[model samples]
Target: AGTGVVSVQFNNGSSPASSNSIYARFKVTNTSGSPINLADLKLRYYYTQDADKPLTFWCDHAGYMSGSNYIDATSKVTGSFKAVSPAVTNADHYLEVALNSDAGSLPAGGSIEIQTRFARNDWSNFDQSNDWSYTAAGSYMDWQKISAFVGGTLAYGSTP
Candidate 1:
């Protein structure tokens, strides 16, 4: 998939086969020459539901990454799980990670990290082996499997 002004990097934070929750760690970067407000960005991590049950999401941590150090911005992050209407194969649900007004902005070449997870309402296990955005990567790298939207328009990656 071709990237837009913004790009997304991903790292799988949990076992991709079976786990109680889906761990998705993302790094959203502003590649354009201008600054972009974090509030205008929305990242979608696509997955499949293992059971016909409600789901819950958690923003474990979110912040700007200065080199290897993390600057906390949890209060500015928001996480939610949405059902995919007219579901596509291997993608029945999507975890949307957004930034609130307090998140500030990302300067050109700057990036922010969002560590998030989701699980069944009852905290049951999930099978992510067949998920659309579930990659087995151990370290952060450019990943188009996860899509990013800027002001409600697709900015990176292809959606299922």
Candidate 2:
């Protein structure tokens, strides 16, 4: 997972602890002219936990970006679709997506772009011994539902 093929620009970290874990990379180019023989390619990962649902994030806009579910059933680029690392969670929070393309026998100006990473370090272990202050629903992608903010202004740290 260090190097096989990787390079993709444009990322929307979607910060709010931005820890749903997402690292992506993609590059496959052959600007159609003559030589093309990039046969058999595949990848899939579409999610929706609750960004209002019914969108999945990206792919299948009536072309190329087809729906995915078989991560990589078959591929051949550097032998076996090179690389893809996936993991997403933030109420199904996908910042941006669409690397869709399955069932392939690529030809006619080949193209390949599949590089990915999504992380979620899972950091949960707290016991402040309760003082008073509670609120939730603030995940990655800078979650929304109202003003999102953190506060602290009553310690005065001297009256103890």
Candidate 2, position 56, lDDT: 14
- Model 1: pairs clashing at backbone N, Cα or C within 3 Å: none
Best candidate per lDDT, number? 1
> lDDT (0-100) at residue 97 of candidate 1?
89
**lDDT by residue for model 2 over 86-145, one digit each (tens)?**
432312222322222333432334434443444323432222112011113222221111
Error of 1 at 3 (Å): 5.6
Off by over 4 Å in 2: 1-20, 30-102, 121-160
C-alpha RMSD for every candidate:
2.5, 17.9
Q: By TM-score, who's the top model here?
A: 1
Error of model 2, residue 20, in angstroms: 4.4
